[PDB]
Amino acid sequence: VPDATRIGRATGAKAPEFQELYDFDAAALTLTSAVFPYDSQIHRAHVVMLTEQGILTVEESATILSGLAQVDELAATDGSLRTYLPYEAALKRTIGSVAGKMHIGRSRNDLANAGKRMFLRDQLLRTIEAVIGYREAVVHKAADHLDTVMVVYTQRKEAQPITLGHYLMAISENLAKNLDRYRELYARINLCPLGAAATAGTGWPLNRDRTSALLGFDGLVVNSIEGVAGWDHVAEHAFVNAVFLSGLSRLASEIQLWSTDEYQVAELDASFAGTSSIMPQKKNPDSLERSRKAAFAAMGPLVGILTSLNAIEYQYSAARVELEPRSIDALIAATHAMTGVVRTLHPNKERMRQYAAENYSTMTDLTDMLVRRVGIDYREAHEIVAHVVITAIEKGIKANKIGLDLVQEAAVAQTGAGINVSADDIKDALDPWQNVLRREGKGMPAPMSVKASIDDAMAELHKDRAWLANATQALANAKQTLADSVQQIIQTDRKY
Amino acid sequence: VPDATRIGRATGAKAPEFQELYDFDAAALTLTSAVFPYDSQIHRAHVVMLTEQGILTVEESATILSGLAQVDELAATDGSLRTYLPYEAALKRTIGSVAGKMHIGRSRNDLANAGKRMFLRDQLLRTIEAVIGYREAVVHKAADHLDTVMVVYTQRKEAQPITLGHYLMAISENLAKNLDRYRELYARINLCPLGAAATAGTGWPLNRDRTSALLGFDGLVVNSIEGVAGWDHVAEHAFVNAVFLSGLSRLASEIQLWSTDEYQVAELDASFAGTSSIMPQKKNPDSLERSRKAAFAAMGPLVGILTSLNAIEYQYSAARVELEPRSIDALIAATHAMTGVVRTLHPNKERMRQYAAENYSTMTDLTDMLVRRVGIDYREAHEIVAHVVITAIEKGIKANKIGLDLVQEAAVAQTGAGINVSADDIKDALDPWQNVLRREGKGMPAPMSVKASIDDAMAELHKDRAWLANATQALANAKQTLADSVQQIIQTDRKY
Amino acid sequence: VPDATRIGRATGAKAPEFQELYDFDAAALTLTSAVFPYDSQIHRAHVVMLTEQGILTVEESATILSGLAQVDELAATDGSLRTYLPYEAALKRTIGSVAGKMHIGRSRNDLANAGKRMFLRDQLLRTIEAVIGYREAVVHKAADHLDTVMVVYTQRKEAQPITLGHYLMAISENLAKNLDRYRELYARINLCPLGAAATAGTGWPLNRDRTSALLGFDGLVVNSIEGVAGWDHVAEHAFVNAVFLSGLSRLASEIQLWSTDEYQVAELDASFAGTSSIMPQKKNPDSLERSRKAAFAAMGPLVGILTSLNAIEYQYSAARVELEPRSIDALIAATHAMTGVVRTLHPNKERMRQYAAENYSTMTDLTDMLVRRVGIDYREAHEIVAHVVITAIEKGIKANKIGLDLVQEAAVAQTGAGINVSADDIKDALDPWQNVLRREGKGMPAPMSVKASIDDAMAELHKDRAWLANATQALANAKQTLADSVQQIIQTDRKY
Amino acid sequence: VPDATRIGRATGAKAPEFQELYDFDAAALTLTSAVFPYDSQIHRAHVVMLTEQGILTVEESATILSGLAQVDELAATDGSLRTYLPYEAALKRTIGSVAGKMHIGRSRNDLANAGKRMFLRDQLLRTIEAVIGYREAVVHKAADHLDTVMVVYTQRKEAQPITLGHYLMAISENLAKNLDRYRELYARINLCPLGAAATAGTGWPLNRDRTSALLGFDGLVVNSIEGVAGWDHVAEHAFVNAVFLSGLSRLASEIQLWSTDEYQVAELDASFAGTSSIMPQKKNPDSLERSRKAAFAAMGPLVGILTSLNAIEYQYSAARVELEPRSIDALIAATHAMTGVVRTLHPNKERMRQYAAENYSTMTDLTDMLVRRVGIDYREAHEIVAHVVITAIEKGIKANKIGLDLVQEAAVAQTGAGINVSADDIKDALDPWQNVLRREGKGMPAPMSVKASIDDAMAELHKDRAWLANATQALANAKQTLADSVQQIIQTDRKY
């Protein structure tokens, strides 16, 4: 059975990234299901620490540790064992009363805070990975389009000539600062609250640094009230998701206007478009509009989380709103979809140039030329060139057909003076590619200038990957250190 | 004429910080009025750069520069001269057609983006200053209350014994990370978009680094589209304001419950409370509730800004929502109010201890003691101590009156076993001050532990002030460098 | 295996309404799964109309209709058949090419709009039913507490004496107007957009009134663009959910303060409270705080939906955010939980009176008495009674112990005059029950006055149920009319 | 001095409605300044009622009433007299101690609730008036464009032929239901809370119905807690503003795409457009984008208000967020701007038809024709016509040039079968005006069908005006009844 939506002009199959937008909602875990594997990690690291502190004997330790493995297996199919006390009770039924001792010096409150941090921690790197791939496809696309002349818009009106490469490097700079936000958020997420217990700590002499290290955290949430009542990192995670996706919505909306029947300066790859069940001509931007949908929805968690913090005291509280897996999954699906939209986007290079040359986006350079050649001030030249456009439209003369005749008519009709410029000065001022080449300062569409943007972005991307690789390896090292600590206590007992 | 609200129990005058909450709304500038002084700075720095680049002659430069001073003076009283083109026209009426030349290689789009950045830049340091003073008063208050034993709450129910100093240091850690957010936001605000012109740059060979340096920016918004279309720093500024104020709302709500007629573990200073026009007994937390009001309202700008970015393309656009001065002013008033609330808060040290000793918040230490002394597991001891509380309530026995009799009754009625502990073990387990001293790990209420929190916070506060002092001095140096550059071009011309 | 959270003071089982708060998230349908049964209804009603219009022959009709029954059965287990085109394709595999003809004069756009309306329609009555039961429990509780004297609060400070019945009737009036909002929303939801097709209608001569009637709608979405682009009813549904839940949050927060260890003027029924895994004394308001959580989260869909409408044109669009089943399910769970909280709430009638008599909430009646007896103006009497409270607190004299001595001291110390009132006048002015009885105007706590509130509410509740019963019966009648129309076309063919 | 922005292509003056968008922010009142005139009305109506109830003597009454007139005059210039207690104190300085007696049986709490209701009440009719004028201009524009053939879009892609009149009547139906929302909100606003006093009523025997009638309310907020704690009407007012403005944003965005350089199917009237200070060609949609800006910002108050209700108990509270005058003023400015945009919009009737005839929006009628003539099912015909479009694009053949040749090629290449239709059948199926005429059902673009929409809308508009006229006259009658009651008590005393 094929994909029944691939009919008419919806040829071939949905690109996999496009398909993600249809799958994430039904496939997303509940928060309980997504966090409960991290709870089992906290159990292991927490009783290991209890053992090294002489709160548990090695016998008690190994009995518990080996029991956790069994219950984890039961929990893979028994949904009811994915919250703490049911899990603790099942451990009691499996290894005896000693199970109770894994909760010494600990609460559900700091267990939850730490476990949810670990979940968001991993989802953050998953996001940074997706945003990097988004930026990679964007920069890489720019590299192939240093000569693709097109108009840039302001207020949805043709403004001035640029190149597609120049435009995409605006996205790259946007994504660079969003990657900064995510890395800055990571440092505030990756702090361990374990040891706070209910909110005030405990008399049992725990080693809070050891539990934190064993679980991959880079530091402690020191104060014990902050440990269970702190939630700003959840709010901030929701925010960056929303602000980043707003930038993604804007790109999707930009490409959607490019790919209108009326602009047609770009076309979505068949694998990122759908069609209508009634209208055979449709090539619909389903990828774009469902990506925007995810960006609009991401404001929900943000508002819910902040409402909840504004509604309580600075306590642990069960009334706080969470950032849900399904919300992150939507972000990932949309980032992936737009990563593939950018990569496979088909610009109509020729109609792009036509617009740049015919639709008067070159009138600024005409104005600048008068100022630079005869020395009149900008505001007066502006009025001359403005009336040139008024006249050219009335008479049906496209920008690239405007001549010395018309510029003199306007200068006279608007000032009584003629003006000292050749037909060559004008022709060159109205050349869209010459508009591009003259804009060669830092951050401007000239190829030499955009290539410099790309060179810096490539180096920043190299550094982005290095940061991600280091943060991932840190967590894997600590996850292995903890696995080894457990095996050793299980072996130490069995052999003595 | 006195303050007519200072009647009945509202004795003395409103504290100045309390009064701010009543004044900021009517006194706040419009965005136009707050930004237009920064536009005049951009004019000076921009034509200076034009001069150093040989786009303007020194004659033209000095004529413009001296004209700006005159129009700035006209604009101090003429409201209509506070947007660009009216201002440019007034300069035309004052120094002639040369006025037009100050707009060479420039647009309203990058002028606005840069000017608004400069406004938010200054408002950010104003905020960091207020948050520092908020943290100072919080830490300083904690220092004076290492021995003030009281209960901490979870879910608005007495949880465990702590000290007021311990609680306030949770706020300090919250404010430390909010100061991090603000400093991280600052780096993204303090980038100069000038040179982007309409969105694509210009043919005029500007020195974008020189304009940026003259205006105090620490770097460039490189890509020209990002220069006029970038808005995330506005969204982020709204966010941090909201997340920080949510933490302030939670403290205000905490103190408001402390200061209820029913808790009465704290009392607002008379200078931060009001009263009723009908009910003479009222001592109302007007300071607290108006501070919360500002925190709730701060979600508005956040949502409006993000809706607006989600609604457009990645272009310059006049449909984007701003962060308004009145919104920042509310934040400042609320931070100041809570700074004074914390400083002058009057804890009822005695009723605080009474609650800690009588209302069963010490039952965890009773449970931990059974586990540590007879070795039973936590879950079983929990059930014993739980039934102890059930029984003690039925019989009207406060926590500090619970005896060996009752613990044995419960252990028997719940297990058939007695349990091996002296009346001394129990008495000490139920001592609230001993609950505090036993919690001596990192971040726990023990005085030695809280004092360590305070010592680290003092050093972080020292560093916070250093960062602020450096960022302020940087802007003042660049503002003086620009004033000198202008004088020199005005002098150079007049003497040659 | 029991509920492992029912330990310590969490005696017995969670009340079923309390349990709902733990089950709704994992049990909620996806929007696709919840809507696809309504699509099959639209298919039947739509081809019936096609048949009555002579667009389909009876042979074609019966073949399709009988095929739908088969595919509906396949779709009960095959998830992929729950979106239109996969469903249409499966019908093609089951009855032949004639399947295609069920889409004549129709689009996915108006199919979706109508189907989602039908889903929200049913969820709206489900909500009105839950809000009625919420109001019933509230009014019924008030009836049993016309004599339960207690303080009302303003700004979380004891204000004046009332009764619990009086308080609950404020909730009743709040819920009455929310029921109005829901009934007003219903009329805007229950309009049929079918016939709009893609957005512009169709040449096929459909009978739009017949399809609308067969599916239970009370009218048409006339204009065809409005039919597929209209979404305000979704926004409004999200809004009423949020505003109603805000009122529910406020009640939950009120009861949570009542039930604090410090107030203890109320206690949650054991079946609506939990406890701590570490602190044995806790009786935690898990029901209340998870109900508030749902209210905070309900702002998310509202913001997402409105962001999405603000981001598009007035077109059909796949970028619009929906109101999800899981969001409604949370509302229902919270309404049910609070319905049971109110019903089983245990007021401590005695400590309620103690507060009313001892904590100075009766000082208004003392003030009013001076004004009514000696004729001084309110503002001066206020200052006398205010200083009475200042003095009484200093000296430790509770309100019900204030005597003629103290009132004369204050009147003298504050004016030099004594004042003409007996010790009986005062004693009666400070009697909290007499404060209640004197407040006998419309909407005031006097029993005769609250009983009148209750009498009107009972009649409004009777009318609320009548409205709901009528709206439900209307849908059931139309659902049966459609079932009969289908059977007849299936019988007509098989017998001819 | 002219408007300095009217340069270049920004010819003539800003239309007044366009200018409103620039003036409302700086001109908006504070909430205090906007409400304090309604407080003086409540004072008059409240002491009149006190007099008729024998709580005040006629001497006391007239002294107060005449004093209010004097203080109202002082308050016109003294800003400090615009909150209650300062105002009461000034009355004390003007007529003596009797001033205090105007507060008998009353609080600031119910004074504020009632006064703010009166302010929102008037602002609601102001809004309903503006929305009516918005709908009038929309319907009236439709009437003039029953023959203006153009494409409708779905997902920003040309869908099917319609007329501009048809499109505008979708807006009319949207605005009709928004007018319903506002009228339904009005009934919940126009209820009088006076008599609630602080929250519990009073012993003084007020006539709550008399005060309510004198102030124009149509009923009572009965329960006294609801009187001061009720706020949902504020939330709802913010909501309808946001949902209505979202519909206005969508129209503004639709017209902005119409008026792009690439579509150019419409052009803004010169009086609703601006231009660039750098780019002479720009004709910028400043009216549209600033109207959208107001719609995005309107989500702020909504979120702030609902956060605040979610954060408190069901009490009077000073932490609740208000709906501000400046927020309503923005709505009014935007409604007025779009009212004039619609009225003066210039459709390019000819390019509209060109698109409808050339860009394949007529392929549905081609498909429907095959189904209606040879009897094949829709899905197969769809695939034929789809490949017709694929082929026509490849070969550069516009829709209106597609012939019998091409339809047979596709039918063969896609099925091996030819198909039985004449070149006349095809030509007529591809005629955009014939597409319009065939869509003649209820709510479809056929002139006879749209004219019926217009006829019903005109009658609904007539009824909208009647409702508004009645609600305005009711308030004016009660405002005169109150003015007469005051004069009579002032005359009665002076003559006796």
Ligand SMILES: NCCN[C@@H](CC(=O)O)C(=O)O
């Ligand atoms: N591609 C999903 C959008 N719905 C189509 C209509 C349809 O699929 O019946 C459209 O408007 O193009």
Ligand SMILES: NCCN[C@@H](CC(=O)O)C(=O)O
């Ligand atoms: N202090 C402002 C709150 N309003 C008072 C009532 C009043 O001032 O009439 C209260 O509820 O205490």
Ligand SMILES: NCCN[C@@H](CC(=O)O)C(=O)O
């Ligand atoms: N009843 C869930 C709240 N968590 C408990 C702590 C715990 O369960 O370990 C409390 O703070 O009371």
Ligand SMILES: NCCN[C@@H](CC(=O)O)C(=O)O
């Ligand atoms: N008409 C306000 C928008 N700003 C112009 C640029 C400018 O005015 O310098 C534009 O982008 O067209």
Ligand SMILES: O=C(O)/C=C/C(=O)O
């Ligand atoms: O028209 C639909 O129901 C699906 C649209 C989409 O694929 O996004």
Ligand SMILES: O=C(O)/C=C/C(=O)O
């Ligand atoms: O009751 C008022 O109107 C003022 C309250 C406040 O001072 O916040």
